[PDB]
Amino acid sequence: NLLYDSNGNIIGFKDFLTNKTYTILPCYSGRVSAAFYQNSSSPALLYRNLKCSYVLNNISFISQPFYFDSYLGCVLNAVNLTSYSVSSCDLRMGSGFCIDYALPSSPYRFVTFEPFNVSFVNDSVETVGGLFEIQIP
Amino acid sequence: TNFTIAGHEEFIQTSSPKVTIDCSAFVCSNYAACHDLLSEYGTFCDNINSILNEVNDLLDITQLQVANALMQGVTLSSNLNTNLHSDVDNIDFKSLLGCLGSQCGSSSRSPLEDLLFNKVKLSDVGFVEAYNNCTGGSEIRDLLCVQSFNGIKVLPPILSETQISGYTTAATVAAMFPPWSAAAGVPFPLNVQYRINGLGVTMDVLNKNQKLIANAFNKALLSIQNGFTATPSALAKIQSVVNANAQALNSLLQQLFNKFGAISSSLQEILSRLDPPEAQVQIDRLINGRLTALNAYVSQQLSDITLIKAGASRAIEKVNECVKSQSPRINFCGNGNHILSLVQNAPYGLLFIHFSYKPTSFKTVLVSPGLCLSGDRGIAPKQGYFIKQNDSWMFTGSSYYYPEPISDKNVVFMNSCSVNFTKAPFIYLN
Amino acid sequence: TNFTIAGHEEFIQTSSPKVTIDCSAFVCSNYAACHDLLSEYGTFCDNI
Amino acid sequence: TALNAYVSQQLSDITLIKAGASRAIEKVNECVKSQSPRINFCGNGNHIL
Amino acid sequence: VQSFNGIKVLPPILSETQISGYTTAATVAAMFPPWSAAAGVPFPLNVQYRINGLGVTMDVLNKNQKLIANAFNKALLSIQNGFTATPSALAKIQSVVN
Amino acid sequence: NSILNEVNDLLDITQLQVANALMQGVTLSSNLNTNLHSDVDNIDFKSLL
Ligand SMILES: *[C@@H]1O[C@H](CO)[C@@H](O)[C@H](O)[C@H]1NC(C)=O
Numbered sequence: 166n167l168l169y170d171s172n173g174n175i176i177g178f179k180d181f182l183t184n185k186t187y188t189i190l191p192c193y194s195g196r197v198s199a200a201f202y203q204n205s206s207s208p209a210l211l212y213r214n215l216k217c218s219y220v221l222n223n224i225s226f227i228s229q230p231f232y233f234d235s236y237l238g239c240v241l242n243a244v245n246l247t248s249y250s251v252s253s254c255d256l257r258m259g260s261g262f263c264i265d266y267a268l269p270s271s272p273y274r275f276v277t278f279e280p281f282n283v284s285f286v287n288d289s290v291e292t293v294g295g296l297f298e299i300q301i302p
Numbered sequence: 303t304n305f306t307i308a309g310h311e312e313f314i315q316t317s318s319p320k321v322t323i324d325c326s327a328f329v330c331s332n333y334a335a336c337h338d339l340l341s342e343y344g345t346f347c348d349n350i351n352s353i354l355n356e357v358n359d360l361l362d363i364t365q366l367q368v369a370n371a372l373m374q375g376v377t378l379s380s381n382l383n384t385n386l387h388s389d390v391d392n393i394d395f396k397s398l399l400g401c402l403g404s405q406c407g408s409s410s411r412s413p414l415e416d417l418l419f420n421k422v423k424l425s426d427v428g429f430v431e432a433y434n435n436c437t438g439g440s441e442i443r444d445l446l447c448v449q450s451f452n453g454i455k456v457l458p459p460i461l462s463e464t465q466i467s468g469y470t471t472a473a474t475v476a477a478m479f480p481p482w483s484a485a486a487g488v489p490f491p492l493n494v495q496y497r498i499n500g501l502g503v504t505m506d507v508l509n510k511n512q513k514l515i516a517n518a519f520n521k522a523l524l525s526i527q528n529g530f531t532a533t534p535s536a537l538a539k540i541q542s543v544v545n546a547n548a549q550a551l552n553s554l555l556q557q558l559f560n561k562f563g564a565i566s567s568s569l570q571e572i573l574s575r576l577d578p579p580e581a582q583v584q585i586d587r588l589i590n591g592r593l594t595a596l597n598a599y600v601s602q603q604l605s606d607i608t609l610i611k612a613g614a615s616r617a618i619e620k621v622n623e624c625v626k627s628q629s630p631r632i633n634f635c636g637n638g639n640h641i642l643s644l645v646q647n648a649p650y651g652l653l654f655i656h657f658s659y660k661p662t663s664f665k666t667v668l669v670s671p672g673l674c675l676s677g678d679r680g681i682a683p684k685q686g687y688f689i690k691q692n693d694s695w696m697f698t699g700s701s702y703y704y705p706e707p708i709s710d711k712n713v714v715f716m717n718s719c720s721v722n723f724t725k726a727p728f729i730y731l732n
Numbered sequence: 733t734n735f736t737i738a739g740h741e742e743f744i745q746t747s748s749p750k751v752t753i754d755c756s757a758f759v760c761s762n763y764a765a766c767h768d769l770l771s772e773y774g775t776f777c778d779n780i
Numbered sequence: 781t782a783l784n785a786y787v788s789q790q791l792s793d794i795t796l797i798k799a800g801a802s803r804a805i806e807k808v809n810e811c812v813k814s815q816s817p818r819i820n821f822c823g824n825g826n827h828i829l
Numbered sequence: 830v831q832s833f834n835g836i837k838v839l840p841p842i843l844s845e846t847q848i849s850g851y852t853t854a855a856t857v858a859a860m861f862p863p864w865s866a867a868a869g870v871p872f873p874l875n876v877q878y879r880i881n882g883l884g885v886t887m888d889v890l891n892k893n894q895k896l897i898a899n900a901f902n903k904a905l906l907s908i909q910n911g912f913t914a915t916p917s918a919l920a921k922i923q924s925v926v927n
Numbered sequence: 928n929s930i931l932n933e934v935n936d937l938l939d940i941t942q943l944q945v946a947n948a949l950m951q952g953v954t955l956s957s958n959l960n961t962n963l964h965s966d967v968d969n970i971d972f973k974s975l976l
Pocket residue numbers: 182183184
C-alpha cells in the first residue's frame with residue numbers, strides 16, 4: 166500500500182477504502198531576494214522561479230500594485246526597462262540583469278548588465294582593389 | 303620534406319556552480335520548537351552564510367576577468383554586425399562564428415558550441431528551466447527541486463552563456479578582418495606564414511603551397527567536429543564537473559535522513575511521542591549533528607574553489623599570449639611546433655583549438671655545424687644548417703629541405719675560426 | 733675584464749606521500765558494539 | 781572531528797604542491813629543453829643553461 | 830603501528846627508477862645529435878650564443894673555449910662536494926618527510 | 928596553535944621572497960641620491976623616493 170524509492174522517500178499511497186491511488190509531492194518552502202539601496206522606503210523583491218500568479222495568490226495575501234514577470238521570476242516594486250543597459254551595476258541578480266535606483270512609479274529599474282563593449286570604427290571591410298582602410302594614429 | 307597541419311583540443315575549467323544554502327530551513331523546516339534551540343546558535347548560522355557568499359564572490363570576479371581578456375583592445379567595423387559572410391581566403395570558419403552582431407534571436411551561439419551544450423543537460427539555462435517546470439505541472443518528483451524546498455538552491459552566474467558566447471565571437475572576428483586588432487595589425491593569411499617561417503621553414507615554399515595550407519585548416523577544423531560523436535578527453539572533463547557537483551548535493555541531502563542516534567531521524571515523530579521536558583535533549587542531538595554536516599560542506603567548498611582559480615589563471619594567461627597575441631615563448635601554447643590557437647565558449651570553462659606544424663616525410667642529409675672563410679674569418683647559420691651539394695656549400699632550413707645560396711641574411715659574422723670549423727676557401731662574400 | 737662560470741642548485745617539490753585512511757580501522761578496530769553505532773552515521777564516514 | 785580536520789589540512793597542502801608543480805613544468809620547457817627570452821625567470825640575472 | 834590502525838602509505842604509479850630514466854634522456858638530448866634539447870645546436874657551440882645574449886665580443890669566447898670547458902667542470906664538482914657537509918637544497922628535502 | 932604557527936611561517940617565507948626580488952642584482956654608487964642627486968631628464972621623481 167506504499168510506494169517508495171531508493172533514498173527513503175514516500176512517493177505513492179493506496180487507500181484501504183475505494184481504490185484510488187495518489188502521490189506525495191513536496192511543498193514550497195523557499196525564500197525571497199530583496200534588493201535594498203542606501204536610503205529608500207521599501208526594497209525591491211524578487212521571487213526566483215515563481216510566476217506572478219502563484220505569488221500574489223498562495224504565498225502573498227497582500228495587494229501589490231507593481232508586479233512584473235521576468236526571466237528570473239516575478240519582480241515586485243520595479244519597472245520593466247530592459248531596453249536600457251548599464252555598466253556600473255551594484256545590485257547584480259545574474260543572467261545579465263541589474264537593478265538601478267533613480268531618485269524622483271517605482272524608483273527601481275530592472276535593466277540589463279553589459280560591462281564590456283567593442284570600439285567600432287566607420288571604416289569599410291571590403292577591399293578597394295588590393296587596399297584596406299586602417300586608422301593610423 | 304613534406305609537412306601538414308594538425309589539430310588539438312583543450313578544455314580548461316574556469317567556473318563552478320554557485321550553491322547557496324540557508325541555515326534555518328535545512329535544520330528546522332517549519333517547527334516552531336525547533337527554532338528555539340537554533341536561536342542559541344545564531345552566530346554559528348551567520349558564519350555559514352558568510353562562507354558561502356565568500357565563495358560566490360570569487361566566482362563573480364573570475365568570470366569578469368575572463369570577459370576582460372576577451373574584450374581587451376578589440377576593434378570592429380561599423381558595416382560588419384549585419385550578418386556578413388564568412389570563408390575568407392578559402393578558409394571555412396562558419397562553425398566558429400555565431401551571430402554577427404545582435405541582429406538575431408535569443409540564441410547567438412556558434413554551430414560548434416551547439417554540439418557541446420546539447421550534450422550537457424545541467425547547463426546555465428538548464429537549472430533555470432528545471433526550477434521553473436517543477437511547481438505543479440505533471441511530474442515534480444525530480445531531485446533538483448526537492449533540494450530547493452529543503453534549502454539547497456543553485457543560482458545562475460552574473461554573465462549568461464549568451465553574453466560569453468558573444469565575447470568569444472568578437473575575438474575571432476578581430477583576427478580575420480581589418481584592422482586586425484587580435485594579431486598586432488597583420489593579415490590573417492600573412493600571419494600564418496611568419497609563424498611557420500620562425501620554425502625554420504623557407505619563405506618561398508609557403509607561397510607556392512598556399513592551397514595545401516588552406517585545405518589543411520579546413521580538414522583539421524572538420525576533423526575536430528566529427529570527433530564529438532564519440533567520447534573524447536575534452537567532453538569527459540566537462541561531464542565530470544556536472545557529475546561531481548550532483549554527487550555533493552545528493553550526499554548533503556542524505557544527511558537529513560540520518561538519525562544521528564538520538565531517538566530517530568525525523569523531528570515530527572519526536573514531538574508526538576515525547577514530552578517537552580525530554581524532547582529538548584533529542585532535538586539538540588539532531589541540530590548538533592546536522593550543523594556538523596553543514597560545517598564540513600562549506601569547508602570543502604573553500605578548498606575546491608582554490609583549484610578553480612588556479613586553473614582559471616592559466617586560461618587568462620593563455621588567451622593573452624596564444625590567442626590575442628603571438629608570444630615568443632616555446633612549449634607553452636601547444637607542443638613544440640606551434641602556429642595558432644583559438645578560443646571557444648564551453649560549459650563551465652573554455653575550449654581551445656591549437657594548430658601545430660606536423661611533418662610527414664624525412665630525409666637524411668649530412669650537415670655541418672659551422673665553417674669559416676679564408677683570412678681568419680667566421681660565419682655560422684641560424685635556424686638552419688650547412689649542406690654541400692655538387693661540391694658547393696649552400697644553406698638549408700632547419701625544418702624543410704630546400705637548398706639556398708649562402709647570403710649575409712641567413713648567417714652571422716665572426717672574427718676567428720673554430721677548432722671544429724671545416725676549412726673551405728672557395729666561398730666569396732662581401 | 734675577466735669572467736668565469738658559476739653554478740647553483742634549486743629543489744622544487746612535485747609529489748607527496750599518499751595516505752589512505754578508513755573508518756572501520758581508526759574509530760574502532762573490531763568492536764561489534766561500536767560498528768553498530770558508527771555505521772548509523774552512514775555518509776559521514778564515506779566522505780572521508 | 782580529528783579526521784575532518786586532517787582531510788581539511790590535506791586539501792590545503794596539496795594545493796600548494798599543485799602550484800609548485802606547475803612552476804617546475806615551466807622550467808623544464810623554457811629553461812632546460814629550450815632557451816626562453818625571459819629574464820630573471822630561470823636563474824638570477826645572467827643565465828646560460 | 831599506524832598501519833594496524835588504518836593509516837598506510839601507498840606507492841605512486843611511476844617508481845623512482847623510471848623517473849630517473851626520463852631525466853637521463855633529457856640530458857643526452859642536449860649533447861649528441863640530433864640535439865633534441867638544444868634546437869639542433871651542439872652543446873659547446875650553444876653556450877657561446879647564450880653568453881652573447883648578455884653582450885660580449887664573440888672573438889673572446891671563440892678563443893677562450895678551453896677556459897669555458899674547464900669552468901663547467903669546477904662548477905659540477907662544487908655542487909657534488911657541497912652535498913656532503915651542509916646542503917642548502919637537501920635541508921628543505923628533509924622538511925618534506927618531517 | 929600548531930596550524931597557526933605554520934600559517935605565520937608561510938607568511939614569513941613569502942615576505943623574504945618579495946624582498947629578495949627587489950634587491951636582486953642592484954648596484955649603487957658612492958655619490959648617492961634622494962636630496963643628493965635627483966630630477967633626471969627634467970622629470971620629477973622625488974615623490975617616488
Ligand atoms: C480494490 O481492488 C481489490 C482487488 O481485487 C478488490 O478486492 C477490492 O474490493 C477493491 N476495493 C473496493 C472498495 O472494491
